[PDB]
């Protein structure tokens, strides 16, 4: 369930850049997951694939 995502600070889907080595366009970025570096309001729930590991 965890889609690939770069290191982004702002909530929402991040824009393109030269930081990524093997991709340029990312869709369905999991900013609702707690493991992102977004703010407190945009982190609300875990993916169902990460509860099995817990």
């Amino acid at each position: 369930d965890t889609n690939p995502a770069p290191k982004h600070k702002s909530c929402g889907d991040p824009g393109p850049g030269n930081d990524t080595c093997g991709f340029h366009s990312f869709f369905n970025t999991p900013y609702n997951n707690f493991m992102s570096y977004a703010d407190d309001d945009c982190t609300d729930s875990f993916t169902p694939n990460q509860v099995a590991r817990m």
């Binding site: 393109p16 850049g17 030269n18 340029h24 366009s25």
Partner: protein
């Protein structure tokens, strides 16, 4: 600057009315000619100094 017909680039022509040389400042200035393409970042070409003859 954008373009209209998407074609490959063999050379980039930049036509300027001045070299940017000041009356007091005698230091040469060097500009950068970047290039942009569809669904990708860039393909850099380098930098060039200004010549009145060219």
């Amino acid at each position: 600057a954008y373009f209209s017909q998407p074609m490959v680039a063999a050379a980039v022509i930049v036509h300027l009315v001045t070299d940017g040389t000041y009356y007091g400042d005698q230091k040469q200035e060097t500009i950068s000619v970047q290039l942009l393409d569809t669904k990708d970042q860039s393909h850099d070409l380098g930098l060039h100094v200004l010549s009145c003859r060219n």
